[PDB]
């Protein structure tokens, strides 16, 4: 992340981000249902953060300080990215839908009134296939990546201190290689529980209620699918075991 | 420091959510309570044995029965989480979340968590349940279920209080330390 974005999401909630004297201007209903906005952008910085770790820290890392054989890399952190590619893109479009929101003469104080159009776009048309189509390659790759994980830290000497190296300083403590890959999986999942709460606070506006609801049943179909188009891949899998499923 | 991983399962509303928040804040949130837990590492110690415990949620992975499994490899202890103001959170306890949790995390210590403690002498909650013929989850039903499927053990705690909490935590950590 850049230090502008973490000291813009640096408090716990929009009302302790905002200044006291701009949040005391607006209703109950207004601060709920934007504290539940800046949770949404909030926790997809920290998934974008997530990303360029398993990119730029990971991968990278050991393409330039380490001797593995071609196709390790890949199998550590697939699609990568393109994952990096779908979220930096929605953070794009989150972050300036909050900065166009911006009262003049301040860089924290703001409103978004119109999130359900951006959720509709993010997860309907050709951006929607792309996401299916990676976590459904993804998640179907998960496990294969933590085997292969698990078994170079315990027969590689160099690797192992590659690993303990970059995962040393404290800001690190939850973002190890089988944290980052769970962490990713789990991204999907979070949606419809940070949009259904945006619902709950969204009824003021008609229109806003009914793009959240779209958004919403987008969201759904779209786990839907990527939840039946996974099969665990695994190193050294025979085709009997496979067409025996 | 040794590593455990522990993750929590049970219904949408049995607050497994809510639990993780408040143990890895040492808090029931005064401004805002988060709708969702992204992950954290615990410092603990347990007994004299100093132990980084992650922490893993399973809400929103409920309807999704491939995605779900993937939370599960190389857990050391199992919270199954219920809730007290919630009968039929309990009863799907058994042949549910127990048989899933079994063929995943073969031999992994589980322990049945009863959550929401405070909710048993509430009146609004009372009430309520009074309306489809039914009453909080009473301590011996979360023993006898506990008892039942397995359980390592079984606690109560309320995230809302705090109390039991830091129990609940300290005992997983000795649960996942045990062979
Ligand atoms: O330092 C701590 C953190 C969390 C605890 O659990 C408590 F919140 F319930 C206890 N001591």
């Given at each position: 992340s850049?230090?502008?974005?973490?000291?813009?999401?640096?408090?716990?909630?929009?009302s302790?981000?905002?200044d006291?004297s701009?949040?005391?201007?607006?209703?109950?209903e207004?601060?709920?249902?934007?504290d539940?906005?800046?949770?949404?952008?909030?926790?997809?910085?920290?998934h974008?953060?997530?990303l360029?770790i398993?990119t730029?820290?990971?991968?990278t890392?050991?393409?330039?300080?380490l001797?593995?054989?071609?196709?390790?890399?890949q199998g550590?952190?697939?699609?990568?990215?393109?994952?990096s590619?779908?979220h930096?893109?929605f953070?794009?479009?989150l972050?300036?839908?909050?900065?166009?929101?911006?009262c003049?003469?301040?860089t924290?104080n703001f409103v978004?009134?119109?999130?359900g159009d951006?959720?509709?776009?993010?997860?309907?048309g050709?951006?929607?296939?792309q996401?299916?189509?990676?976590?459904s390659?993804?998640?179907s790759?998960?496990?294969?990546a933590?085997?292969?994980?698990?078994?170079?830290?315990?027969?590689?000497?160099?690797?192992?201190?590659?690993?303990?190296?970059?995962?040393?300083?404290?800001?690190?403590?939850?973002?190890?290689?089988?944290?980052?890959i769970?962490?990713?999986?789990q991204?999907?999942?979070?949606?419809?529980?940070?949009?259904?709460?945006?619902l709950?606070?969204?009824?003021?506006?008609?229109?806003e209620?009914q793009?959240?609801?779209?958004?919403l049943?987008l969201?759904?179909e779209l786990?839907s699918?990527?939840?039946?188009g996974?099969?665990?891949?695994?190193?050294?899998a025979?085709?009997?075991?496979?067409?025996?499923? | 420091a040794?590593?455990?991983?522990?993750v929590?399962?049970?219904?949408?509303a049995?607050?497994?959510?809510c639990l993780?928040?408040?143990?890895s804040?040492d808090?029931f949130?005064?401004?805002?309570?988060?709708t969702?837990?992204?992950?954290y590492?615990?410092?603990?110690e347990?007994?004299?044995?100093?132990?980084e415990?992650?922490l893993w949620d399973?809400?929103?992975?409920?309807?999704?029965?491939?995605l779900?499994p993937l939370?599960?490899?190389?857990?050391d202890?199992?919270?199954?989480?219920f809730?007290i103001?919630?009968?039929?959170s309990?009863?799907?306890?058994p042949?549910?979340w127990?048989?899933?949790?079994?063929?995943?995390?073969?031999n992994?210590?589980?322990?049945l968590?009863?959550?929401?403690?405070?909710?048993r002498?509430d009146?609004?909650?009372?009430?309520?349940l009074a309306?489809?013929?039914?009453?909080?989850v009473?301590?011996?039903?979360?023993?006898?279920?506990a008892?039942?499927?397995?359980?390592?053990?079984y606690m109560?705690?309320?995230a809302?209080?705090?109390?039991?909490?830091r129990?609940?935590?300290?005992?997983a950590?000795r649960?996942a330390?045990?062979?």
């Open positions: 850049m230090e502008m974005d973490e000291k813009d999401f640096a408090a716990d909630s929009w302790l981000a905002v006291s701009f949040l005391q201007q607006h209703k109950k207004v601060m709920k249902q934007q539940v906005i800046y949770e949404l952008i909030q926790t997809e910085l920290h974008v953060r997530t360029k398993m730029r820290l990971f991968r890392g050991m393409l330039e300080e001797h593995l054989e071609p196709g390790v890399v550590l952190f697939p699609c990568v990215d393109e994952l590619d779908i930096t893109r953070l794009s479009q972050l300036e839908r909050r900065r166009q929101a911006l003049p003469g301040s924290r978004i009134h119109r999130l951006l959720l509709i776009s993010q997860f309907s050709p951006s929607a296939e996401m299916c189509k990676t976590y390659e993804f998640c790759r998960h496990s294969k933590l085997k292969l994980y698990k078994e170079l830290y315990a027969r590689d000497k160099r690797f192992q201190q590659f690993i303990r190296k970059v995962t040393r300083p404290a800001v690190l403590k939850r973002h190890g290689v089988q944290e980052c769970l962490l990713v999986t991204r999907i999942t979070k949606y419809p529980l940070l949009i259904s709460r945006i709950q606070h969204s009824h003021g506006i008609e229109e209620r793009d959240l609801t779209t958004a049943g969201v759904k786990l699918n990527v939840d039946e996974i099969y665990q891949l695994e190193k050294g025979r085709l009997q075991e496979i067409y025996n499923r | 040794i590593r455990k991983k522990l929590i399962v049970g219904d949408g049995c607050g497994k959510t993780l928040i408040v143990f804040k808090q949130p005064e401004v805002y309570v988060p969702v837990f992204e992950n590492v615990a410092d603990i347990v007994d004299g044995k100093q132990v415990l992650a399973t809400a929103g992975q409920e309807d999704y029965d491939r779900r939370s599960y490899p190389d857990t202890v199992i919270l199954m989480c809730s103001d919630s009968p039929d309990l009863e799907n306890i042949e549910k127990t048989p899933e949790v079994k063929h995943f995390c073969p992994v210590p589980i322990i968590v009863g959550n929401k403690k405070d909710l002498n009146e609004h909650t009372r009430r309520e309306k489809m013929k039914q009453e909080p009473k301590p011996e039903e979360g023993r006898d279920m008892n039942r499927i397995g359980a390592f053990g109560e705690c309320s809302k209080t705090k109390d039991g909490v129990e609940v935590f300290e005992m950590t649960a330390l045990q062979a």
